Amino acid sequence: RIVACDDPDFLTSYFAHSRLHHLSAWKANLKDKFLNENIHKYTKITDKDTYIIFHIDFDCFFATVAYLCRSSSFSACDFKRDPIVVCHGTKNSDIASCNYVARSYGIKNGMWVSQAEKMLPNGIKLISLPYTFEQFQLKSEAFYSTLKRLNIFNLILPISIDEAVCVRIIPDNIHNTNTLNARLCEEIRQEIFQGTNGCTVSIGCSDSLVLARLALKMAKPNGYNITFKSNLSEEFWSSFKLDDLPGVGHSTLSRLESTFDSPHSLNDLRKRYTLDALKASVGSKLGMKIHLALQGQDDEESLKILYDPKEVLQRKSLSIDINWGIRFKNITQVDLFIERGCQYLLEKLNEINKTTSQITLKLMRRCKDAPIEPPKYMGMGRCDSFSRSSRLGIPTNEFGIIATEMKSLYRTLGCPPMELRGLALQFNKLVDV
DNA sequence: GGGGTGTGGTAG
DNA sequence: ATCGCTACCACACCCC
Ligand SMILES: Nc1ccn([C@H]2C[C@H](O)[C@@H](COP(=O)(O)OP(=O)(O)OP(=O)(O)O)O2)c(=O)n1
Ligand SMILES: *[C@H]1c2c(cc3ccc4cccc5ccc2c3c45)[C@@H](O)[C@H](O)[C@@H]1O
Ligand SMILES: [Mg+2]
Ligand SMILES: [Mg+2]
Ligand SMILES: [Mg+2]
Ligand SMILES: [Mg+2]
């Protein structure tokens, strides 16, 4: 029934179930597809061009598709009336996606099922649907195909399985730009709904990447929003949390909330901040990025994907990360796992016709004062992260060289097998042919 | 007195 | 039970 981490089937089984594995693998495939489809198309934007960004994503993607494709066992439930989540388990299992009914009760993606169940009023039951991974891929394919078929974008950039940044180069100062672009948003939404047999998308439309992303958030669910730099207002900025900004996650949020005393929205932040205080709080680069974002402007790093997508989407490293289900008794089993992981990576490296000249082993070790078993079944729990890299010299795809050095890096780090809670094996530098 | 490594962080 | 991946950016430290 259960495949343990010392079983040869473990990696196959874990990756077959892991939604985060699928997200990353799908993204890697989409980047490759982009490169292959545009090998003769030399399209890119310059700092002289005027353009409009359409940032397009599916509403509650896994929930929508899992519902549409649900087994006969779930015939009864109603996507507009019932709170619906996609997950594996029944207690401390991540909600991959939840529908907007579930969200009306305060349920959010990434919440455990056990937290979610508490938020429902008595009587109302949470509906848990299984993942339909294959069908997520087919719906994505129909999405990307529709975007291309419309023949309206100069550039279509894959962000994720359910999300694309689509660029139209346009003349500066078009008359009736808001109406003309609204019509495009309406057409796009209709075509994708038809082309995916009933999945909805939202669209954020602007003249910068950062504003198009924010506009998309404002549009959800099942809508569009057009907010150009010239349309910015306090009311717009009042609608966004600080971590709605790209590059602001949980850690950066914590720092900003401390420095600026818990602003409730981007408008509150806009009113309190200085560039110097930002940089002191979150560092020079991120500080500048945020400052620019609060003016509706993109930083230069973010713009690289417009100016040279082929360079940006090129793969520069290859790794696996397993930080769930890792429970080893001894070093013999750790070594066998490292060997299997190295072969998995070599099969991928060989499939993309590359070699590697540098590797890294990263591990998660149980914190001294953390419980031996965490609350989440097979979770890593609270850990310290340690890593060591090695240059191999000449670029290679030889198992003997790579795997031997990986096992050696494990020994240098000195983690007792019973304290190990996660492992990452990385090929950091790749060379073609 | 500039750069390589380990560490921390972000996005779906 | 439950499936906490993975590419890529940033930067503090520490070298002699
Ligand atoms: N930590 C994450 C992030 C995303 N996903 C998966 C499930 C989501 O359905 C899909 C797309 O991610 P989004 O962040 O776009 O979330 P949704 O599409 O579910 O909702 P929204 O309507 O907010 O876009 O990726 C996941 O499993 N775990
Ligand atoms: C697991 C992990 C870590 C950090 C965080 C921080 C904030 C979180 C909020 C909500 C859910 C959640 C789940 C897993 C998390 C979270 C959060 C890291 O410290 C750890 O290494 C893992 O990524
Ligand atoms: Mg989204
Ligand atoms: Mg989505
Ligand atoms: Mg998305
Ligand atoms: Mg954010």
Numbering used by the authors: 306 to 738
Sentences from the study reporting this entry:
Rev1 is thus unique among TLS polymerases in its protein-template-directed mechanism of DNA synthesis and its specificity in incorporating C opposite template dG. An α-helical substructure at the N terminus, an N-digit (residues 305–355) augments this embrace and makes critical interactions with the incoming dCTP and the templating base.
The incoming dCTP does not pair with templating 10S (+)-trans-BP-dG; instead, Arg324 (from the N-digit) acts as a “surrogate” residue and makes a set of complementary hydrogen bonds with the cytosine base of the incoming dCTP as observed previously in the unmodified structure. Consequently, the BP moiety is located in the major groove of the DNA. Interestingly, the BP pyrenyl ring system points towards the 5′-direction of the modified strand. This is made possible by the modified dG base tilting by ~ 44° in the 3′-direction to create room for the BP moiety to extend in the opposite direction, as shown in Fig. 3a, b. 2-dG adduct differs in how it is accommodated in the Rev1 active site versus free DNA, the torsion angles α′ and β′ defining the local conformation of the carcinogen-DNA linkage site are similar in both cases and are in the most favorable range for a 10S (+)-trans-BP-dG-modified nucleoside, namely α′ = 180 ± 40°, β′ = -90 ± 40°51.
